[PDB]
Amino acid sequence: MLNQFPGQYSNNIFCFPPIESETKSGKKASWIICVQVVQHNTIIPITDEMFSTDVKDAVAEIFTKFFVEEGAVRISKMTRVTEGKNLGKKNATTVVHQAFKDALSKYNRHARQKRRGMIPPMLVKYFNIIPKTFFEEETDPIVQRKRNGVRAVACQQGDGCILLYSRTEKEFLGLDNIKKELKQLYLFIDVRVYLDGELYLHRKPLQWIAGQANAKSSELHFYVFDCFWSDQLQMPSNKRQQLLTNIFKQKEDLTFIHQVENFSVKNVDEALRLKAQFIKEGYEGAIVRNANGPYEPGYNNYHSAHLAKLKPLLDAEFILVDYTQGKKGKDLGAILWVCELPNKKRFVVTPKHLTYADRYALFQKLTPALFKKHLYGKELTVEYAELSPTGIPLQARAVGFREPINVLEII
Amino acid sequence: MLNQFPGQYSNNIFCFPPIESETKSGKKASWIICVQVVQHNTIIPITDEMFSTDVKDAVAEIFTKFFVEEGAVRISKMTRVTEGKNLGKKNATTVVHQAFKDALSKYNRHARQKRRGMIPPMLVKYFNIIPKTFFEEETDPIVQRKRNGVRAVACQQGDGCILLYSRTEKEFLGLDNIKKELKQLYLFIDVRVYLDGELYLHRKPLQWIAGQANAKTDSSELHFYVFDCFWSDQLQMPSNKRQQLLTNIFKQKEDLTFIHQVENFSVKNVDEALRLKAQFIKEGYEGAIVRNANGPYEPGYNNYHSAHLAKLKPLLDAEFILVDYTQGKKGKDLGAILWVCELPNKKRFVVTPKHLTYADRYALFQKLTPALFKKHLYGKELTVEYAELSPGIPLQARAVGFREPINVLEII
DNA sequence: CGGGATGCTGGTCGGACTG
DNA sequence: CAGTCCGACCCGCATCCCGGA
Ligand SMILES: Nc1ncnc2c1ncn2[C@@H]1O[C@H](COP(=O)(O)OP(=O)(O)OP(=O)(O)O)[C@@H](O)[C@H]1O
Ligand SMILES: Nc1ncnc2c1ncn2[C@@H]1O[C@H](COP(=O)(O)OP(=O)(O)OP(=O)(O)O)[C@@H](O)[C@H]1O
Ligand SMILES: [Cl-]
């Protein structure tokens, strides 16, 4: 299929992307290679069918065009492809398909003769909250599913090696099914691009997925949800996702590598419905990306404020050790609980099922005495997001106690 | 030049190493490829001169031999090499040289069709001490120079990539001069081998060497000095055997410019080892490495240090505040005074008086008082020769002397 | 300095080859 | 007769050498 090759198609002539460079004189140079199909002294339009079956007396011609900054163009002689290769085998190529292969050959080699390490993948700062600025952009944010697998970044070392490394900046062993497909895909795409994704196979626990990724069965898939260039880390998230989609338009025959579906939302409610939907399809949640977010690598565990994860909260039990009130605004005068981690380190937990009138009334009517006799030392189940690395649970809310009490009635 | 190719030479026929395999029946199979040079219907001996100039009407013949466990041998047809390649260019090969290239081709491909990640480099436990067990082995230990550079392990990923990683298990950028030569060297050597060495360029500070190794834009001026090798499937292999394999690897290619084997020295006693250490310091190296002859390769998994290597280097210098004194507990150190300095973190450690006899250490610990020490030694600054920092206390610490010099034997 | 030619390794294809 | 080896064919990466500026 055409458009699997990089470049623009126009007036029946397909041209690969111009490769620009500087010369000794300091002027700008451009070099372009182009493919055309000639039958009966006529350039005919290129069709997807002629990649499977030849057309009678059609000849493919390849030529290059070269010119300095605002100078006259120079053309090469036409190399005529009149015949496919591996002509007897199942490897056989059509004339047209073989010409594009030779064109992409000369193109990739020209790029190599006239032209990179591991970058830590970007990390998500926000958790079940979407900053209002996400919907103040000219473009709507993107929503993606949140797969509970193992994270991996792909790149090509320039010598030709495909690098698959981890969130801990560690190269992966095995995954030959994926590295094989990445080697194929990198012939058709810019070799400097980093592909950022998740190793995963659906309906499988993370212990199994992490088991295959770390160990040295070729059954995992690679779901790419982002890309970036080392020299253009400020490129907006939106533009990075159009480029990523042009990369995957090229190859749709891949079996183990997949682009992650992108969803547009205009408000928080649209986003929370997609998060609901992905949980029922068995995923871990949703990812929200600001449309103008740059690529902020996670150097020294840095989290970007232009992504948000939408996940369900974790469950745990803690010992209630004290109570207090909120400080800021509406939370001022509203009661908060103080649980404690086994390290005697303590944290605030928010009553989830009480109105603000209750939180005000409860903090007014409670005494150190009545809390020592009825609440101290009780076990309290706490929905929380993450543990601050401090170990403190973040965004902690009290679901309820084991032994059920009504705190409104305590005397 | 012949011995640049793996295999044995005998009766004028060179044969590459047998590649063994299993069959469905479970019997052992062996496959061998061999090269011979025939002139006038006679196998003539292969010479290094035939790699630069052809011999008239000599033809090189390549053939394979294949046989199952204790079964009759099967022979292939002879592939005749009558002509070198790149015949007009400076790339030209002789007939004989071209045949060995084609043999090593079929050999490497057969090995690939019938057949690995980072392992943390092994770490040195002992410091300016050589255990007596090093000299109880059937073979004498090996001493090497200690280059103050950056450590690196080389291996080949099997797909064809050359991996150069660090002690931190992190792949290196740049070093194209070194990776280029490793790719050429790995055509002739077992592809399963790890080469363990040091990135270095002599008479240059470590800030510069580390500067070129870490950055992705080095000037391609560093060298790679290999001092060990290992196989993932045979980490119990004794140090001695690993160094012959390593030396056979480097016998092959001596044309390399950026890759070097580290000179091996035999010693029979501690004094022999310390003279080599002295000698390397005067040539500007950091010290010596001592390897027990039967030491396996123990990778530094959780910063694990192997008790079958020892470094011999000069000690570091520092100043600490004297805060207390005590005595030794074990044997000859019993009743002998020790000082107690303190790190800025208020953590304290024992320092040994270096220039006092044991009679002095006994007398001092008997005659000293908390009073006399609080008034003349407490809080003073004391220079301390030490080895390393315990992962923070200085280890093997010795007192050179104080800033303001006092004679502690005369304190009253 | 751009590119054809040459040779190399790794990939796939297809036809023996042999227990 | 089931892998099991291997020549053949392509292709990306090197180097060598000769136009092409
Ligand atoms: N489409 C996606 N976009 C971004 N991240 C995704 C996506 N699908 C799955 N993920 C995973 O979610 C993680 C979000 O980054 P974050 O810093 O939140 O990780 P974490 O909190 O340490 O791990 P977890 O999110 O599992 O608790 C990434 O590491 C990635 O592996
Ligand atoms: N011939 C050699 N054999 C072994 N190690 C060598 C040799 N030459 C230099 N070295 C270096 O000495 C180091 C000894 O390992 P060790 O665990 O003692 O390192 P370290 O103590 O953390 O670093 P340093 O030795 O610089 O203090 C190796 O990492 C290696 O880089
Ligand atoms: Cl040396």
Residue numbers in the entry:
A (entry chain B): 1 to 115, 121 to 221, 224 to 396, 398 to 419
B (entry chain A): 1 to 115, 121 to 396, 399 to 419
Question: What's in the article?
Answer:
Crystals of the non-catalytic form structure were grown in the presence of ATP but without Mg2+, which is an essential cofactor of the adenylation reaction. We found that the non-catalytic structure adopts an extended fold and the ATP is bound by the AD domain and stabilized by various interactions. Besides hydrophobic stacking with the side chains of Ile294 and Phe232, the nucleobase of ATP forms one hydrogen bond (H-bond) with Gln149, via the N6 and OE1 atoms. The sugar pucker 2′-OH group and the oxygen atoms of the phosphate groups form H-bonds with the side chains of Lys151, Glu203, and Lys316. In the non-catalytic form structure, the substrate DNA was bound by the NTD domains of two AsfvLIG molecules and adopts regular B-form conformation; though the DNA adopts a regular B-form conformation at the two ends, it was significantly bent and unwound around the nick site in the catalytic form complex. The ATP was captured in the active site of the non-catalytic form AsfvLIG:DNA structure. The catalytic Lys residue (Lys151) and ATP-interacting residues of AsfvLIG are highly conserved in the homologous proteins. A bound ATP molecule is present in the non-catalytic structure, demonstrating that AsfvLIG has ATP binding and catalytic mechanism commonly shared by many other ligases.
